[PDB]
Design a protein around this ligand. Structure first.
Ligand SMILES: [Mg+2]
Ligand SMILES: [Mg+2]
Ligand SMILES: [Mg+2]
Ligand SMILES: [Mg+2]
Ligand SMILES: [Mg+2]
Ligand SMILES: [Mg+2]
Ligand SMILES: [Mg+2]
Ligand SMILES: [Mg+2]
Ligand SMILES: [Mg+2]
Length: 132
RNA sequence: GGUUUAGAACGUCGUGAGACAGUUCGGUCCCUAUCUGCCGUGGGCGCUGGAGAACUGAGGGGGGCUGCUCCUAGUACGAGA
């Protein structure tokens, strides 16, 4: 009955739909998904992750994987600086996906996590040292 | 330096002088450029009164190589490497 944290590695790479990634984790691993962060773009378009519970956006910088990059936050989820820093196009897809996410996922519950029934899912990149 | 002169020897051929597209050691490389051409550099005259400058630019030449590293990114691609 050991608890599981989930880390979605390799956001530097062109990946699958993180929605679909949640299905594969719930369906095939028989365990609930509770997103904590959410990727904004992937591959050449990875811009960072929006934290769902802190409501802010940590901005990914390319190739600082050897040390820890400068923590660069954009506060609001509708902050027009998220549009400026990420492009308003990608910024809306963040907003859209987040809508769908809330209707098909889970709030992180500490009790169910310790019971091994939901996993806190973090999206990141261990190579870029971002999300760790 | 090689190799078609003259010296000398070996093998080889020839009775021999010699000979071998066999080898071996030695062994004189001239020219003050008239013309053409070319690199530079002046003189003359022209250009329509003479002169001092600053120009335009028809055209002509020069130039034109490329390694490695880093960012993108160990991303696309790839099961990996
Ligand atoms: Mg791929
Ligand atoms: Mg001779
Ligand atoms: Mg002789
Ligand atoms: Mg003969
Ligand atoms: Mg002549
Ligand atoms: Mg030219
Ligand atoms: Mg030329
Ligand atoms: Mg040209
Ligand atoms: Mg293959």
């Amino acid at each position: 009955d050991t608890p599981i944290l989930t880390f979605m590695n390799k956001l530097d790479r062109d990946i699958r739909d993180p929605m679909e990634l949640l299905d594969e984790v719930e369906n095939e691993l028989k365990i609930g998904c509770a997103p904590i962060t959410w990727p904004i773009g992937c591959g050449k378009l990875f811009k960072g992750v929006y934290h769902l519970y802190k409501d802010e956006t940590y901005l990914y910088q390319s190739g600082k994987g050897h040390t820890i990059q400068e923590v660069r936050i954009v506060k609001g989820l509708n902050n027009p600086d998220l549009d400026a820093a990420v492009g308003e196009d990608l910024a809306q897809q963040l907003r859209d996906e987040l809508e769908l996410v809330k209707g098909a996922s889970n709030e992180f519950d500490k009790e169910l996590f310790l019971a091994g029934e939901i996993t806190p899912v973090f999206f990141g990149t261990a190579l870029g040292n971002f999300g760790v």
